[PDB]
Each structure stands twice: as structure tokens, then as C-alpha cells.
Amino acid sequence: DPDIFNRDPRDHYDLLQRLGGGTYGEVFKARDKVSGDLVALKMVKMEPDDDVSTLQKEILILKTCRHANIVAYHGSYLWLQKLWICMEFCGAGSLQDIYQVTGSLSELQISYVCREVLQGLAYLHSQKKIHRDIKGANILINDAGEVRLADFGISAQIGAELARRLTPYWMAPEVAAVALKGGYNELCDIWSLGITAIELAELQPPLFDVHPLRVLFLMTKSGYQPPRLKEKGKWSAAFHNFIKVTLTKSPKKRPSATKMLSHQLVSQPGLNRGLILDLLDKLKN
Amino acid sequence: VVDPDIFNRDPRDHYDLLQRLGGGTYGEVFKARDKVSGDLVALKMVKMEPDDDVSTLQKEILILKTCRHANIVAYHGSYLWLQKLWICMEFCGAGSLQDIYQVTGSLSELQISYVCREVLQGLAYLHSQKKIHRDIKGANILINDAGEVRLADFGISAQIGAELARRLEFIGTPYWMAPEVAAVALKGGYNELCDIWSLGITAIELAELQPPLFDVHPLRVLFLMTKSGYQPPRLKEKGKWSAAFHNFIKVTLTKSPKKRPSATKMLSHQLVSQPGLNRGLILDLLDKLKNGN
Ligand SMILES: CC1(C)OC(=O)c2ccc(Nc3ncc(-c4nc(C5CCOCC5)no4)c(N[C@H](CO)c4ccccc4)n3)cc21
Ligand SMILES: CC1(C)OC(=O)c2ccc(Nc3ncc(-c4nc(C5CCOCC5)no4)c(N[C@H](CO)c4ccccc4)n3)cc21
Ligand code: NA
């Protein structure tokens, strides 16, 4: 990235605790030495001859977002052959971290989450960005009960892959759409949010118990039926309709994020971060 | 310590010194050639006794070493040997834009537009690195033989940084200090938008071969700028320049720093995003320079 700091991140942050890590790198809870504010620092391998294009695109996405519902970005550091991406500290982790302990969320809790995610998606889509990986694991929660979309890794990989693949004159229109856009548009995020709502209500997405390759074939068949909430009586008509409309099969009829923000499930009164503070209290006690 | 990455060795073991390019209070600058590759460098040689304060040179090297961008002069390391500090930097064979226009005369509007775009790219980078150049002018914009525009001479930036750090060390107890006094102590009295103003003056310099008020006593200029009613300068020969150039001058020379556009914002201005802004404009300038020499 053109604006990476060629400086030691430890000169700027005290690494308080390692929060997690794997093949994707490591994530640390850290404190700004000057301000005392908490941040999350993601440390990834970045060696002299490594391919940087995907991490490049991820930083580009983060640096150009300025919206409360997208994780804040505080710059990146290249030091000791590691790239340190400094981002917002969301002290409750992801909704997936939470629901593995609490169990399914209430309808009001899901409605608030969906509203907040839709606010972030409307912003991303207004910038011609697509998240492409909406799911409970990528929706982070801070100690105030606020909701932030995170982890643009898949979006960055696709943005880099599409550019690498980037003569068209013999291509069928459906091939040209893959070469230029990847074969779909920003409305894929709306579908993914509908699946995520089911995930929050039922602790797993539809077909989670089916082999993933069979799932791919099933969804690509003509006649695939969009999924539904299993226990119809547990949920209001508004929630069922939210699922029906977000899981519209044809992208030409699936509503945009801005339009979905007017849906009765997410525009109803009484949706606020207190609903998630309740969830965090259940997680704690 | 001046520099954790300092080379404690004689730079003349690696480089053959060619001509002295310049010299003065700041030290001496030499053209030099790598004994292996034959590549050219510029070496700045400064006196460095064990008793001397290293803070300013430490901060200049820090800027050169950490700020890596296609519009910032390249850095090749530093040497300490026999109480002389040698800062090894990019050889920019055409010298500065001032060296150039003293031979070629005024630049074309397209050439100025290209220079402004390249400088703005370097400034946007520097400002994102939390640095302020503070000495943008034709003499500090170098052109290498590839026609690339490189911001150079961070001596003033380093001096200001060193003075701020020293004054903070002696600020004393803060509990009775007003917030604006604390802000001046931590951040100085102005911000990075000062560089945008300086670029506007530089654009006039490239068009007219002098900055505005060049013939006015420097103390009188300082007084006039602090007067209420001060009018930012303008290009003098209005008909020679396009409305876009006049507007570029108008907005970069916005008097109030709260209303002056950032480097990133200025990069969207018509003058620096118009078609035909390419490196060939600078190579044509260098062709004219070579004909003049
Ligand atoms: C890396 C990721 C997802 O991509 C981004 O773009 C981003 C932006 C801000 C980010 N900030 C942040 N801040 C605080 C936490 C936190 N987790 C906990 C407990 C929760 C229960 O299990 C142990 C840790 N406590 O705080 C956090 N956790 C996440 C989700 O668990 C995480 C941590 C480590 C490794 C991967 C992902 N992420 C993260 C991310
Ligand atoms: C010292 C300075 C400005 O601060 C930096 O950060 C830096 C980085 C690389 C730097 N590299 C470089 N490379 C090559 C030249 C060159 N000048 C000529 C002709 C041009 C016509 O008159 C005679 C010399 N031929 O090559 C050069 N000249 C400049 C501008 O004159 C200069 C030389 C000595 C002292 C101050 C400034 N500077 C310099 C500098
Ligand atoms: Na100079």
C-alpha cells in the first residue's frame, strides 16, 4: 500500500494481549501509547518477494471507508517482515463467538443487527464496494453493543483476482460479465445478510449439514428454493418477509441495501444497542 | 545516536567522489559513482563531532529513510567516518527546477501542471506519513535524468521537528496552561496545509521565474502577510494562462488554512487531472535544458 508506515508498530502500541491467530496471521489487543485508546492489530506475513496484491486491496478498502458500521482503520506498518493492520477494537468479538455461548438471538436482537449491517452495506455499495463474505463471524460487536462489519479478505482476494484476469471481442455476454465484474453484483450481500439472519436465529445457515460441493450444485440448479426459517411460529410475519425478500433468487428483483433499510423489520422503533448489551449480559452471566 | 542504521565505515571505500555539486553552512554535496555498478549518487557531507547535537540530522535521515514514494528523493544510507556524516541520496542529474528554469526560462502551463500533480502526490504521501515538508519551492523539487519529479531537502522539516521536541522537553508543568498553548507545544502553530500554499507560490515561480514579492524586503513581506486584509498573490500575465491555472492558484493560495484544500483534494483539480499530463513533458524540458547547455 502506498501509505504504509515503515516503522515499528511497537513504538506506537503496547501489545496488551494476543486475541487469536492462525494461518491468516495473528490478532492482538493493543493500546495506543499516546492516546490510551484500544485497537486491534492484525499481524500478517509480508516478506520481500511475497505477492502483496491481495493485502494491498484489503488495505485500500479499509482506508477509504469512513462509516460507523465499518471497522475503523488506523493505518498499517511494515516491520520485521510483517504487515501490521491497525483496526477498531470490538471487545466482544464476532456474533459467532457470542452465539456459540448464548444460543440463538431474539428477533429484536437480529433486527437491530440487520439494520446496522444494512447501514454498513448501503455505505459500501455507494462506493461500489462489495463485502462478499457477510456472515456471523464477520460481524463484530464492541462492549457498547455497537455493530461493525469486518474482514474484507475475500473481497480483497476477488478484487485482486479480477484485476489479474484483467481480449473480450469473442466473449458471450455472460462470459464478459465474469471477466469484468466476476459474474454478480452488490446484491449478493443482501442475500448473505438474509442467510446470516437465519444463522443468528438457528445457530447455523441452511444446508449446513449438507456436503458443500452438493450445496453448490443444488443452489445452481434451476428450481432451487430459497431457504426459510424452520420454526415459523417463533418469528413474526415481518421477520419471515425480511427473509423472503432478502433471499430473492433473481438479482434483478432483490432489493438494494438502502431499500431494505425501509423494511418493517429493521425500521421498527426500539432497535438500539441495548438489545446487544442484553446479549452480552447473557454471555457473561 | 544519529541513525541506528549508520554505516561505520569510509564511504570512499564504496564510492568514487566526482565533482562537488555545492556546499555551504549545511555541508558539502558531491556527485559520486558506485565502484561496482557505476551508478551515480549524491553524497551530503556534514561535520559531526562527538559533542554536536544530532537531533536535526537524526530527524532528516529518519524522514529520508522511512518516506519511500515515487515523488520523494531516494535514500541509500548514511556513513559516519572521522567525524563526518555522509548522507547518501539519489543523484538527480538535472538538479532542481530552479537550476532548470534559470537556463530554459519559464515552463509551459502543461509542464507546470505535471509538476504540480507530481508534487501533490508526494505531499499527499508525506502528509499521510504525518510529516510536513515546510520548504516547498523550485529549488527543492529535483528532476532526475528519467524525468521523475522528486521532493527533496527535508532540512527545514527536520529542524522544526528538532526544535519542537526540544521545546517540549522544557515545557514545564502544564496544569495552568491554556489548551491552545498545549496544542502549540505538541503540534506547532500550523499544519500540513502550509505545503499547499507553498506549492501555489512554486507554480507562480515556475511560470514567472520569481515568487511574488521577490523584490520586497523579507521582513516587510512577513509583516504584510500577518496584516488583516492581506491579499494572496496571483499570476501577473492573466492572458497567458488558462482559467484552470488561475483557479488552481486561487484555491492553493486560500488565506485561511481551515478552508485551504488538502493535497488529496487538490489532486482532483482540473489543472492536474486534465489529459496530456505525462512524463514526456519533463523529458522535453530536459531536452531544452540540454540544448541550452
Ligand atoms: C481480523 C478481523 C476479523 O478482520 C478485520 O477486518 C478486523 C477488524 C477489527 C477487528 N477487531 C477485534 N477486536 C477485538 C476482538 C476481540 N475478540 C475477543 C474474544 C472473542 C471470543 O474469543 C476470543 C477473543 N475479544 O476482543 C476481535 N475478535 C475477532 C473475532 O473473534 C478475532 C480475534 C482474533 C482473531 C480473529 C478474529 N476483533 C478484527 C478484525
Ligand atoms: C541537497 C539536496 C537538495 O537535499 C536533498 O535531500 C537531496 C537529495 C538528492 C540530491 N541529489 C542531487 N543530485 C544531483 C544534483 C545535480 N545538480 C547538478 C547541477 C545543476 C546545475 O548547477 C550545478 C549542478 N547536477 O546534478 C543535485 N543538485 C541540487 C540542486 O542543485 C543540489 C546540489 C548541491 C547542493 C544543493 C543542492 N542534487 C540533492 C539533495
Ligand atoms: Na535545498
XYZ file of C-alpha atoms and ligand atoms in Angstrom:
659
model
C 0.000 0.000 0.000
C 1.280 3.482 -0.864
C 0.675 4.824 2.671
C 2.171 2.043 4.819
C 4.273 3.239 7.757
C 7.837 1.907 7.503
C 8.071 1.983 11.286
C 7.984 -0.307 14.306
C 4.370 -0.727 15.494
C 5.724 -1.426 18.987
C 6.966 2.177 19.048
C 3.302 3.217 18.794
C 1.274 0.499 20.551
C 1.647 -1.636 23.657
C 0.553 -5.172 22.763
C -1.699 -5.943 25.724
C -2.786 -9.472 24.812
C -2.881 -11.843 21.859
C -6.561 -12.361 20.999
C -6.184 -15.134 18.429
C -4.368 -16.317 15.360
C -3.858 -18.940 12.673
C -2.682 -19.299 9.076
C -4.268 -15.872 8.442
C -1.827 -14.278 10.897
C -2.343 -13.119 14.468
C -4.618 -10.521 16.066
C -3.599 -8.540 19.152
C -5.440 -6.322 21.579
C -3.245 -3.233 21.812
C -3.270 0.244 23.325
C -2.206 3.463 21.622
C 0.813 4.767 23.527
C -0.192 8.410 23.027
C -3.978 8.270 23.416
C -4.536 5.141 25.503
C -7.280 4.027 23.102
C -7.654 0.317 22.422
C -7.125 -1.066 18.915
C -6.895 -4.451 17.254
C -3.632 -5.154 15.421
C -3.652 -7.872 12.765
C -0.148 -9.186 12.029
C 0.379 -10.944 8.689
C 3.490 -12.291 6.987
C 4.942 -9.846 4.451
C 8.349 -10.994 3.189
C 10.482 -9.377 0.448
C 9.321 -11.476 -2.534
C 5.753 -12.160 -1.367
C 2.737 -11.313 -3.509
C 1.225 -8.173 -1.974
C -1.740 -7.590 -4.295
C -4.420 -9.088 -2.030
C -3.267 -7.382 1.173
C -2.854 -4.260 -0.969
C -6.521 -4.367 -1.955
C -7.676 -5.099 1.610
C -5.871 -2.012 2.931
C -7.274 0.029 0.032
C -10.819 -0.988 1.017
C -10.294 -0.231 4.711
C -8.504 3.092 4.202
C -11.292 4.568 2.051
C -14.193 3.665 4.372
C -15.396 6.213 6.926
C -18.650 4.867 8.363
C -19.544 3.858 11.906
C -20.730 0.382 10.844
C -17.444 -0.477 9.068
C -14.461 -1.262 11.303
C -12.322 1.844 11.687
C -8.848 1.813 10.136
C -5.818 3.442 11.760
C -3.032 2.638 9.291
C -0.612 -0.190 8.589
C 3.015 -0.883 9.480
C 5.635 -2.903 7.623
C 8.266 -4.079 10.082
C 10.344 -7.212 10.698
C 8.811 -8.751 7.549
C 5.288 -8.478 8.977
C 2.430 -6.199 7.962
C 0.510 -4.851 10.974
C -3.003 -3.658 10.077
C -4.414 -1.456 12.847
C -8.206 -1.545 13.205
C -11.071 -0.921 15.612
C -11.159 -2.880 18.857
C -14.505 -4.704 19.170
C -14.172 -6.307 22.582
C -16.983 -8.871 22.325
C -15.614 -10.494 19.175
C -17.936 -11.701 16.446
C -21.580 -12.681 16.679
C -20.401 -16.238 16.021
C -18.168 -16.055 19.109
C -21.188 -14.840 21.073
C -23.928 -17.187 19.883
C -21.759 -20.283 20.445
C -22.276 -19.454 24.141
C -25.628 -17.647 24.327
C -27.634 -19.668 21.830
C -29.946 -18.141 19.265
C -30.616 -14.413 19.294
C -34.021 -12.870 19.858
C -35.918 -11.414 16.920
C -35.330 -7.879 18.204
C -31.598 -8.561 18.557
C -31.468 -9.903 14.981
C -33.490 -6.925 13.708
C -31.025 -4.471 15.254
C -28.044 -6.399 13.859
C -29.617 -6.467 10.394
C -30.329 -2.737 10.475
C -26.731 -1.964 11.448
C -25.290 -4.336 8.827
C -27.579 -2.817 6.186
C -26.342 0.659 7.113
C -22.792 -0.528 6.520
C -23.728 -2.325 3.286
C -25.531 0.727 1.883
C -22.347 2.714 2.521
C -20.057 0.115 0.943
C -22.336 -0.262 -2.075
C -22.449 3.525 -2.502
C -18.660 3.291 -3.011
C -19.041 0.383 -5.478
C -17.539 -1.943 -2.876
C -18.921 -5.431 -2.244
C -18.218 -7.261 1.005
C -18.849 -10.738 -0.493
C -18.462 -12.516 2.880
C -21.358 -11.441 5.107
C -21.813 -13.959 7.944
C -21.934 -14.001 11.729
C -18.171 -14.460 12.037
C -17.565 -11.175 10.159
C -19.974 -9.016 12.187
C -18.098 -7.686 15.211
C -19.574 -6.344 18.446
C -17.986 -3.841 20.809
C -18.571 -3.550 24.553
C -21.141 -0.791 23.915
C -23.277 -3.174 21.848
C -22.389 -1.478 18.553
C -22.101 -3.450 15.315
C -19.254 -3.340 12.789
C -18.687 -5.179 9.529
C -15.188 -6.614 9.329
C -12.799 -8.864 7.389
C -12.554 -7.728 3.766
C -10.156 -10.566 2.941
C -12.456 -12.331 0.483
C -13.427 -9.013 -1.127
C -9.718 -8.196 -1.470
C -8.882 -11.606 -2.956
C -11.630 -11.234 -5.571
C -10.682 -7.636 -6.347
C -7.094 -8.766 -6.861
C -8.071 -11.886 -8.828
C -10.413 -9.949 -11.125
C -7.639 -7.437 -11.852
C -5.104 -10.188 -12.577
C -7.505 -11.802 -15.048
C -7.945 -8.265 -16.411
C -9.358 -9.768 -25.285
C -13.145 -9.587 -24.999
C -14.419 -9.446 -28.567
C -15.373 -13.148 -28.851
C -16.869 -13.467 -25.345
C -20.520 -14.225 -24.802
C -22.170 -11.534 -22.635
C -22.333 -13.899 -19.655
C -18.589 -14.541 -20.018
C -17.837 -10.825 -20.281
C -19.764 -10.312 -17.032
C -17.441 -12.737 -15.244
C -14.321 -11.199 -16.792
C -15.349 -7.658 -15.791
C -17.480 -7.952 -12.629
C -16.990 -11.555 -11.512
C -20.480 -12.649 -12.564
C -22.637 -10.909 -9.935
C -23.225 -7.558 -8.245
C -23.508 -5.917 -4.825
C -26.911 -7.545 -4.208
C -25.074 -10.744 -3.277
C -24.503 -9.077 0.111
C -28.275 -8.738 0.621
C -28.775 -12.481 0.161
C -25.872 -13.207 2.512
C -27.455 -10.998 5.178
C -30.694 -12.968 4.910
C -28.737 -16.192 5.410
C -26.943 -14.547 8.342
C -30.298 -13.696 9.912
C -31.218 -17.391 9.750
C -27.786 -18.222 11.187
C -28.433 -15.924 14.149
C -31.907 -17.413 14.670
C -30.960 -21.090 14.286
C -27.171 -21.240 15.040
C -26.265 -22.418 11.511
C -27.072 -21.387 7.939
C -29.440 -23.511 5.821
C -27.971 -26.728 4.406
C -25.029 -26.513 6.841
C -25.315 -30.297 7.308
C -25.037 -30.964 3.544
C -21.710 -31.557 1.809
C -20.532 -28.162 0.480
C -20.000 -29.414 -3.076
C -23.543 -30.787 -3.191
C -24.751 -27.439 -1.842
C -23.021 -25.584 -4.695
C -24.707 -27.851 -7.255
C -28.091 -27.511 -5.525
C -28.044 -23.693 -5.479
C -27.027 -23.527 -9.153
C -29.875 -25.743 -10.345
C -32.912 -24.176 -11.914
C -35.659 -24.582 -9.334
C -33.535 -24.057 -6.221
C -35.885 -22.914 -3.475
C -34.648 -20.028 -1.291
C -34.447 -21.192 2.342
C -36.819 -20.254 5.136
C -36.904 -20.058 8.922
C -37.684 -23.515 10.302
C -39.896 -22.648 13.299
C -42.496 -20.398 11.692
C -44.353 -19.759 14.961
C -41.285 -18.392 16.777
C -40.983 -15.418 14.406
C -43.162 -12.510 13.304
C -44.556 -12.001 9.813
C -42.081 -9.130 9.445
C -39.104 -11.443 10.030
C -40.462 -14.052 7.605
C -40.962 -11.364 4.961
C -37.459 -9.975 5.558
C -36.105 -13.457 4.821
C -38.362 -13.828 1.781
C -37.259 -10.545 0.214
C -33.538 -10.687 1.041
C -33.442 -14.255 -0.319
C -34.966 -13.268 -3.656
C -33.431 -15.654 -6.188
C -33.243 -13.236 -9.125
C -30.741 -10.401 -8.506
C -32.911 -8.174 -10.718
C -35.643 -8.338 -8.041
C -33.570 -8.461 -4.836
C -33.847 -5.049 -3.131
C -30.843 -2.829 -2.510
C -29.450 -2.187 0.960
C -30.955 1.315 1.019
C -34.385 -0.071 0.122
C -34.035 -2.855 2.699
C -33.454 -0.232 5.408
C -37.108 0.773 4.914
C -38.349 -2.783 5.560
C -40.621 -3.112 8.581
C -38.273 -5.481 10.419
C -35.381 -3.004 10.530
C -37.296 0.303 10.556
C -39.446 -0.528 13.587
C -38.931 1.501 16.783
C -36.984 0.207 19.751
C -33.932 -1.142 17.895
C -30.824 0.028 19.737
C -27.546 -1.237 21.150
C -29.235 -2.090 24.448
C -30.564 -5.241 22.805
C -26.973 -6.395 22.299
C -25.946 -5.250 25.781
C -28.596 -7.726 26.964
C -26.986 -10.418 24.808
C -23.553 -9.653 26.269
C -25.003 -9.825 29.786
C -26.375 -13.281 28.950
C -22.943 -14.242 27.608
C -21.321 -13.091 30.857
C -23.879 -14.379 33.367
C 22.518 8.160 18.162
C 22.259 9.847 14.758
C 20.939 6.771 12.954
C 20.550 3.136 14.095
C 21.359 2.011 10.532
C 24.520 4.116 10.192
C 27.457 2.617 8.315
C 30.577 2.959 10.479
C 32.940 2.951 7.524
C 34.538 5.163 4.892
C 32.074 5.865 2.038
C 35.056 6.287 -0.286
C 35.666 2.544 0.044
C 32.406 2.142 -1.919
C 32.140 5.351 -3.971
C 34.498 7.350 -6.160
C 33.960 11.033 -5.419
C 33.452 13.083 -8.559
C 32.690 16.812 -8.583
C 31.498 18.900 -5.670
C 27.958 19.891 -6.659
C 27.514 22.558 -3.982
C 28.328 23.490 -0.442
C 27.699 25.872 2.406
C 26.772 26.026 6.070
C 24.772 22.785 5.748
C 27.869 20.925 4.490
C 29.074 19.866 1.045
C 27.315 17.816 -1.642
C 29.271 15.571 -4.020
C 28.489 13.632 -7.147
C 29.855 10.119 -6.660
C 29.978 6.817 -8.544
C 29.489 3.316 -7.141
C 32.778 1.477 -7.658
C 30.985 -1.746 -8.630
C 27.814 -0.844 -10.514
C 28.877 2.546 -11.864
C 25.610 4.018 -10.566
C 25.668 7.674 -9.540
C 24.688 9.020 -6.122
C 24.720 12.347 -4.317
C 26.621 12.443 -1.015
C 25.999 15.204 1.523
C 28.958 15.548 3.903
C 28.314 17.259 7.255
C 30.654 17.821 10.193
C 29.761 15.567 13.130
C 31.800 15.884 16.309
C 31.016 13.733 19.372
C 29.730 16.849 21.175
C 27.375 18.095 18.450
C 23.614 17.848 18.828
C 22.468 15.107 16.441
C 18.730 15.791 16.712
C 18.254 17.672 13.428
C 20.337 15.301 11.292
C 18.733 12.326 13.054
C 15.301 13.592 12.017
C 16.368 14.347 8.439
C 17.720 10.807 7.989
C 14.565 9.412 9.597
C 12.394 11.186 7.007
C 14.565 10.118 4.063
C 14.735 6.514 5.285
C 11.051 6.000 6.152
C 9.311 8.042 3.397
C 9.552 5.848 0.258
C 7.486 7.127 -2.659
C 7.991 7.818 -6.360
C 7.845 11.590 -5.715
C 10.308 11.664 -2.778
C 14.047 11.639 -3.446
C 15.584 8.207 -2.927
C 17.831 7.349 0.020
C 20.826 4.978 0.028
C 22.061 5.109 3.640
C 24.418 7.163 5.769
C 28.056 6.877 6.832
C 29.909 8.112 9.910
C 33.671 8.312 9.440
C 36.297 10.571 11.028
C 33.713 12.968 12.481
C 31.936 13.480 9.162
C 28.409 12.278 8.451
C 27.766 11.345 4.812
C 24.121 11.115 3.742
C 23.854 9.114 0.506
C 20.905 10.119 -1.666
C 19.602 9.893 -5.217
C 21.605 11.546 -7.978
C 19.136 13.770 -9.838
C 21.180 14.832 -12.841
C 19.109 17.833 -13.930
C 19.316 19.415 -10.492
C 16.352 21.393 -9.228
C 13.581 23.068 -11.173
C 15.309 26.349 -10.261
C 18.542 25.135 -11.873
C 16.459 24.208 -14.912
C 14.388 27.362 -15.381
C 17.480 29.532 -14.946
C 18.542 28.003 -18.289
C 15.241 27.242 -20.046
C 13.095 30.163 -18.938
C 9.514 29.770 -17.793
C 7.827 26.387 -18.005
C 4.769 25.800 -20.154
C 1.406 25.557 -18.436
C 1.283 21.821 -19.172
C 4.765 21.343 -17.699
C 3.746 23.280 -14.578
C 0.545 21.231 -14.331
C 2.538 18.000 -14.440
C 4.999 19.245 -11.815
C 2.091 20.263 -9.575
C 0.451 16.846 -9.898
C 3.693 15.068 -9.042
C 4.422 17.375 -6.094
C 0.852 16.940 -4.818
C 1.312 13.161 -4.957
C 4.465 13.494 -2.869
C 2.724 15.848 -0.439
C -0.308 13.583 -0.044
C 2.103 10.780 0.819
C 4.182 12.896 3.202
C 1.104 14.233 4.990
C -0.284 10.710 5.388
C 3.080 9.831 6.976
C 2.428 12.679 9.474
C 5.231 14.834 8.036
C 5.220 18.442 6.834
C 7.791 19.489 4.244
C 7.641 23.233 5.100
C 10.081 24.253 2.335
C 8.311 23.560 -0.963
C 9.887 25.705 -3.712
C 11.511 25.220 -7.097
C 14.955 24.756 -5.547
C 13.726 21.738 -3.527
C 11.984 19.880 -6.367
C 14.619 17.782 -8.137
C 14.397 16.226 -11.603
C 16.332 13.051 -12.275
C 17.561 12.000 -15.705
C 14.474 9.772 -16.050
C 12.257 12.869 -15.905
C 10.898 11.954 -12.473
C 9.867 14.696 -10.050
C 11.332 14.205 -6.559
C 10.717 16.303 -3.463
C 13.969 16.902 -1.595
C 15.714 18.859 1.185
C 13.992 17.936 4.449
C 16.447 20.068 6.425
C 13.831 22.626 7.447
C 11.295 19.901 8.290
C 13.929 18.205 10.450
C 14.971 21.477 12.111
C 11.362 22.286 13.031
C 10.836 18.768 14.365
C 14.003 19.021 16.450
C 13.015 22.431 17.825
C 9.508 21.220 18.725
C 10.954 18.216 20.565
C 13.419 20.396 22.480
C 10.782 22.962 23.456
C 8.507 20.144 24.651
C 11.300 18.779 26.853
C 11.323 22.133 28.690
C 7.588 22.935 28.549
C 7.354 22.561 32.331
C 4.266 21.769 34.349
C 1.083 22.000 32.214
C -1.760 22.275 34.734
C -2.312 26.043 34.304
C -1.748 26.095 30.528
C -4.499 27.028 28.113
C -5.422 24.326 25.560
C -4.103 26.373 22.643
C -0.737 26.701 24.404
C -0.631 22.923 24.905
C -1.537 22.410 21.237
C 1.258 24.705 20.029
C 3.681 22.831 22.292
C 2.682 19.407 20.933
C 1.844 20.245 17.304
C 3.283 23.670 16.482
C 1.254 26.662 15.419
C 0.155 25.485 11.953
C -0.407 22.309 9.965
C 0.431 20.458 6.751
C -1.762 22.740 4.627
C 1.137 25.206 4.668
C 2.679 22.985 1.967
C -0.325 23.535 -0.326
C 0.179 27.301 -0.145
C 3.884 26.843 -0.888
C 3.038 24.758 -3.967
C 0.836 27.583 -5.239
C 3.721 30.026 -4.872
C 6.009 27.497 -6.586
C 3.608 27.297 -9.536
C 3.903 31.079 -9.949
C 7.682 30.756 -9.571
C 7.798 28.233 -12.432
C 5.605 30.498 -14.582
C 7.356 33.808 -13.832
C 10.916 32.883 -12.663
C 10.403 34.626 -9.275
C 7.943 34.153 -6.412
C 5.561 37.070 -5.819
C 7.086 39.961 -3.853
C 10.610 38.671 -4.598
C 11.824 42.293 -4.679
C 10.264 43.260 -1.319
C 12.334 43.206 1.862
C 11.734 39.851 3.617
C 10.711 41.467 6.913
C 8.170 43.642 5.091
C 6.741 40.534 3.402
C 6.333 38.832 6.784
C 4.547 41.899 8.149
C 2.189 42.179 5.169
C 1.078 38.534 5.404
C 0.094 38.955 9.061
C -1.953 42.074 8.358
C -5.686 41.643 8.141
C -6.611 42.478 4.550
C -3.612 40.605 3.113
C -4.413 39.559 -0.445
C -2.989 36.288 -1.768
C -0.884 36.819 -4.883
C -1.912 35.906 -8.418
C -0.340 35.229 -11.788
C 0.636 38.561 -13.296
C 0.094 37.989 -17.048
C -3.531 36.858 -16.911
C -3.936 36.231 -20.644
C -1.015 33.790 -20.841
C -2.694 31.206 -18.580
C -5.923 29.220 -18.644
C -8.832 29.701 -16.266
C -7.922 26.334 -14.730
C -4.408 27.548 -13.859
C -5.776 30.787 -12.404
C -8.238 28.766 -10.316
C -5.513 26.357 -9.154
C -3.602 29.401 -7.885
C -6.741 30.821 -6.261
C -7.521 27.688 -4.255
C -3.988 26.663 -3.253
C -3.432 30.241 -2.045
C -6.512 30.229 0.170
C -5.632 32.545 3.040
C -7.477 30.711 5.815
C -5.827 27.326 6.494
C -9.186 25.960 7.695
C -10.518 26.441 4.142
C -7.394 25.501 2.162
C -7.733 22.193 0.268
C -5.630 19.174 1.181
C -3.178 17.541 -1.217
C -5.634 14.725 -1.933
C -8.395 17.230 -2.675
C -6.093 19.265 -4.934
C -5.288 16.131 -6.956
C -8.893 16.259 -8.216
C -8.454 19.804 -9.547
C -8.947 20.288 -13.289
C -5.401 21.561 -13.803
C -3.766 18.367 -12.509
C -6.273 15.835 -13.897
C -6.548 17.175 -17.461
C -5.396 14.961 -20.354
C -1.875 15.050 -21.715
C -0.076 15.177 -18.353
C 2.770 12.744 -18.986
C 6.466 12.335 -18.283
C 7.267 13.371 -21.860
C 6.566 16.960 -20.792
C 9.539 16.812 -18.408
C 11.767 14.967 -20.871
C 11.013 17.747 -23.356
C 12.062 20.279 -20.706
C 15.306 18.343 -20.204
C 15.861 18.292 -23.977
C 15.558 22.087 -23.942
C 17.925 22.244 -20.960
C 20.493 20.126 -22.816
C 20.200 22.395 -25.859
C 20.776 25.375 -23.565
C 23.859 23.750 -22.028
C -9.316 -9.849 11.966
C -10.680 -9.211 11.696
C -11.847 -10.156 11.950
O -10.729 -8.758 10.344
C -10.947 -7.369 10.324
O -11.105 -6.687 9.365
C -10.991 -6.892 11.755
C -11.163 -5.599 12.283
C -11.190 -5.412 13.647
C -11.047 -6.491 14.497
N -11.079 -6.199 15.914
C -11.312 -7.113 17.013
N -11.277 -6.575 18.218
C -11.464 -7.321 19.292
C -11.721 -8.672 19.137
C -11.927 -9.453 20.272
N -12.121 -10.762 20.317
C -12.271 -11.142 21.569
C -12.515 -12.577 22.036
C -13.778 -13.065 21.490
C -14.010 -14.542 21.801
O -12.871 -15.413 21.506
C -11.535 -14.873 21.775
C -11.372 -13.365 21.573
N -12.164 -10.073 22.341
O -11.941 -8.986 21.531
C -11.759 -9.214 17.853
N -12.025 -10.628 17.627
C -12.104 -11.197 16.299
C -13.300 -12.139 16.255
O -13.163 -13.047 17.312
C -10.840 -12.007 16.036
C -9.882 -12.130 17.028
C -8.736 -12.873 16.789
C -8.558 -13.483 15.561
C -9.517 -13.362 14.571
C -10.668 -12.620 14.808
N -11.552 -8.407 16.825
C -10.865 -7.762 13.977
C -10.849 -7.949 12.574
C 20.928 18.599 -1.034
C 19.531 18.191 -1.506
C 18.821 19.300 -2.276
O 18.754 17.830 -0.371
C 18.288 16.520 -0.505
O 17.512 15.986 0.216
C 18.897 15.951 -1.765
C 18.777 14.668 -2.322
C 19.423 14.400 -3.504
C 20.155 15.371 -4.146
N 20.784 14.974 -5.382
C 21.284 15.830 -6.425
N 21.782 15.200 -7.477
C 22.288 15.882 -8.480
C 22.269 17.263 -8.442
C 22.812 17.935 -9.521
N 22.939 19.242 -9.690
C 23.532 19.450 -10.853
C 23.890 20.800 -11.466
C 22.698 21.621 -11.664
C 23.067 22.991 -12.230
O 24.116 23.687 -11.480
C 25.219 22.870 -10.962
C 24.858 21.435 -10.569
N 23.786 18.282 -11.419
O 23.339 17.304 -10.583
C 21.741 17.904 -7.328
N 21.700 19.358 -7.239
C 20.990 20.013 -6.157
C 20.246 21.219 -6.722
O 21.162 21.998 -7.442
C 21.986 20.480 -5.098
C 23.328 20.177 -5.229
C 24.228 20.605 -4.265
C 23.779 21.325 -3.167
C 22.435 21.624 -3.030
C 21.537 21.199 -3.999
N 21.257 17.156 -6.350
C 20.286 16.635 -3.591
C 19.618 16.916 -2.376
Na 17.895 22.894 -0.873
